Amino acid sequence: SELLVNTKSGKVMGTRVPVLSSHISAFLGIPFAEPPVGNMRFRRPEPKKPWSGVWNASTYPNNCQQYVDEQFPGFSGSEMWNPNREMSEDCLYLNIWVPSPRPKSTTVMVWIYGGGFYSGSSTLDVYNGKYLAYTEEVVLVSLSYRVGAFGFLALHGSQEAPGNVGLLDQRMALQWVHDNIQFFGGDPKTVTIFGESAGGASVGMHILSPGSRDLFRRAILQSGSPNCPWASVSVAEGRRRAVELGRNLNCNLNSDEELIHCLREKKPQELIDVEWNVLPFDSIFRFSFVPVIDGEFFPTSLESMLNSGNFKKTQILLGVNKDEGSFFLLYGAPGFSKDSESKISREDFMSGVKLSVPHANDLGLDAVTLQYTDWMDDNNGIKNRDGLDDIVGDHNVICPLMHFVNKYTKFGNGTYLYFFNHRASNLVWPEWMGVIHGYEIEFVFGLPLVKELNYTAEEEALSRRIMHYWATFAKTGNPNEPHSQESKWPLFTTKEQKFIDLNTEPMKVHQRLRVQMCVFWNQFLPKLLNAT
Amino acid sequence: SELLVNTKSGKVMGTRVPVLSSHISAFLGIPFAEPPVGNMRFRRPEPKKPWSGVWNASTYPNNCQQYVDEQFPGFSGSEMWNPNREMSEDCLYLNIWVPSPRPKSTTVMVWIYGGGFYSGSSTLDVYNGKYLAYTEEVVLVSLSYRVGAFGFLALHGSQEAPGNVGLLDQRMALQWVHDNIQFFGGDPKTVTIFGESAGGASVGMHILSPGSRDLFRRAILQSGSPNCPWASVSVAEGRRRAVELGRNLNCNLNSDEELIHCLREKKPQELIDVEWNVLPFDSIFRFSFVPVIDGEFFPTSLESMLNSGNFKKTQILLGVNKDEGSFFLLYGAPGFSKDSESKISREDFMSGVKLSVPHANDLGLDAVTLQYTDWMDDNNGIKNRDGLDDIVGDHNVICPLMHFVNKYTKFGNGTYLYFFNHRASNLVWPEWMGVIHGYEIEFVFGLPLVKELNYTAEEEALSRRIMHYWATFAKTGNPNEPHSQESKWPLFTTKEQKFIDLNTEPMKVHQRLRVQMCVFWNQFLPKLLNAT
């Protein structure tokens, strides 16, 4: 049968779903690991043991246990990121969309969701793989992984809670794809991994990690990279946060076993309830339980690996949006509101930068402030707002990614760089927020192709050219097809450093993306913080 | 007799000189001090003891002993600054231009020359007082003072070479004006001191020093100010350089008396020959023998005085030229030439900043570099040239002065600020040097009124409006003729921070002269260097 597939662990039965006046095949909620429940909380994932009978792969799986956003209840702009089904620790599932009829040896694309390593789900509406899988005739997979403490509680030296298990989940799903995607008409030799924000960083992390390199061919990174400040911690810091988590729940802290055993008796939301409390600073764009530089998943520091060329060498396609920072100011910085234009006072601006660069000393703070203040106009609330937006975005996303793109291109086999700066005509967030962190995503997934979503002709065309770039890249390592000149996306090189704008307008080529700000963030500021 | 004048120290005979189809009285080379010779080199100046008979004050006196610049022999652009008279240690004289007929009790303006405290002459063609005295009917006085080692060798504790004696020369000349200016028709209660560069700095130094305040009514500062980084040194540094000067001359260094004795037997030119060797670093815009923060001419640190309001409260009129830096790059930095466009390579631009901020640590150097480099275009030889020009001008003149004008204004009784940015139509220096340090002087002194000098009609008009400002300010404390037609130069207030452009175009008001850069020099950079 087309819907019935015998995999290396059992038979699964999928469903025929419609898409754009046609249909494709969907297999939802296939398990790829043993339920990381009970005594297996915090432990490495174990491969899903073979089942007898047919697995109902007809409906989305549970979502992983995560903090749930309630700032704006009812509000679609924030609620679209929240879990859209039951939360459970039994959440290690993946989903597959196969074009109908089933192709032979076609290109595979594995989605990896963001959410700052504390949240995120594969079952979200924006990650509906049907449009992209159908329009671009690729086998589309979306995996899942443990988030928050469940995924990234790190007590180095313990084999009970080593850290990074959330990335290991992703690896096991990648390993599952390598073993079974051929049964779905997928070529396991042509797998492109891709993800946004935290998902972006994850993609990069699998590039660096040796135990991950052979489980995929190429990589797309959207608005995230492995070296992001919010995206990892030392073993010392992971331990400290872990120990501090026990403290918030009256746990025994004399040993890891006692500490771990304690945290395992607690219910999931008990952990989540106190999760934010282990952060060292009052901060924004910082998350408690994130990957650790352990010496195992990552043999040595990210920078050194980047320097020595110790990573997977292939093609990467990567980029950022114009206003990466606004979402996080709204949730964590004074003066910002979803309902005003959020002109920021000088006072809230100063307040802002302190939250944004939580680890800086006073000289570092003055440096950042100077770097973003127009002194002919320091009490301009609009410039102060856009300034703070750029500080958050440049520091957490754009500049970390550029450092990565420059480092990778020395050893890579082809880099493509984009700047996404279209603002959706139907955005429900206020104008001041601009081109928001996460909002290129709906374009990648072909959401503008559906008429009821009320996008414009030009946005549908944009999404269509975007999906094509994505998939074409995925099959060939080049987002370009050999005709027109309308237009060719240039290769990013060490010398000329080209990239392209992604919007409704005809393609423009620029050079040196946010280089002025990024020299500050990548070279001056770090040298300054080390020095002082 | 108009030309014969009985002063407190003896009779004096001047001479009738022609000016612009008319005539005025000059009194050239009037002594105000005992010749600081022999046992009195380095020593405080002593008043000129009374003479018999009639002094022939009809010719220009000697110029003080100084480094003569031989870079462009024959070239008028450099040679206009060199000694136009014989050099000697017997140089403590002043010059007076008196309207004809002699005014009853008219405004007095005393000129103090620049030259980095190492050079300078009262007798220069460009400091010729006849036009200004004549046109605005003021009594114009030209003082002099010992420069370099002779004027500013400082060995704290010693009474033989205490430091600051050249500032004391100035004071003594001011004292002479106080005692004798009435005999020329001048009001000793209405004396404006003015000077450019070192003169400008000196003018503010008298503003600060308690023992100089009662010797003048108000102050004009052009392209210099007391807080300039080149304009003073500490006791420690001052001694170290003095001791080093003796080391370069095989002097006994075992005590101040044996060092001073050794340096006193040397011919002046021997001193000057090694003068530059005692500088701490390879630098531009640095000079070896300058005023000392000594606890006597300056009771406390210059910055503490400005803070406490410890200084003369009167009116000041002050400003800068658009390209303070070019003159010094030409004599000091790689890539700069009188005869090319001096487009600067990135490597030379690097060398430039190290030469220009010779006290910065590496972090400091990185900050300056970042602050002035456009990283989309870093190999632009013009942008690198202009940028290094701005670095020099902003660091050494513009930003010091803005610091001064802001601090002063909190206690002052009226501030006027100008940005001089006209390039003379007949400049002999290359186009790339722009509006040069010291080239507003010829406009202040009325040289464009003389037809054979070949200034344009618009430049003569500019000199006239500029002289009227300086004079009107000197008479009333305000450059504007109140309730007259012409547009009015606004007060600089700590809130609005207004100033004007000075050029051939109608007047423009602006606010916050070079804030962005001066915030960096005055606030950020010193914080960076103070850290460890």
Ligand SMILES: COc1c(C(=O)CCC2CCN(CC3CCCCC3)CC2)cc(Cl)c2[nH]ccc12
């Ligand atoms: C949960 O809210 C916070 C934060 C935040 O960082 C909120 C900003 C995120 C909220 C949701 N959204 C998620 C992404 C997921 C991947 C694709 C793009 C959208 C945007 C970012 C910070 C602190 Cl300190 C908080 N404290 C309490 C709640 C809370």
Ligand SMILES: COc1c(C(=O)CCC2CCN(CC3CCCCC3)CC2)cc(Cl)c2[nH]ccc12
């Ligand atoms: C003598 O030059 C130097 C320097 C300098 O930085 C000074 C260059 C000056 C040349 C004369 N010029 C005229 C001024 C006079 C005052 C009014 C305005 C115009 C100003 C610039 C530095 C070093 Cl290390 C030197 N070594 C040898 C000569 C020399």
Ligand SMILES: *[C@@H]1O[C@H](CO)[C@@H](O)[C@H](O)[C@H]1NC(C)=O
């Ligand atoms: C799979 O589960 C769905 C959801 O409950 C159900 O409607 C469907 O009938 C099931 N399929 C089979 C073959 O049992």
Ligand SMILES: *[C@@H]1O[C@H](CO)[C@@H](O)[C@H](O)[C@H]1NC(C)=O
């Ligand atoms: C990719 O690898 C091939 C084979 O080694 C090489 O010829 C090609 O130049 C590489 N491309 C890039 C952009 O590095």
Ligand SMILES: *[C@@H]1O[C@H](CO)[C@@H](O)[C@H](O)[C@H]1NC(C)=O
């Ligand atoms: C003053 O000096 C000038 C020039 O040297 C000379 O012509 C004049 O005669 C002198 N005056 C007297 C009274 O000797």
Ligand SMILES: *[C@@H]1O[C@H](CO)[C@@H](O)[C@H](O)[C@H]1NC(C)=O
């Ligand atoms: C100057 O001082 C006088 C006398 O105290 C005062 O009336 C006047 O307002 C002052 N002017 C300024 C500009 O400070």
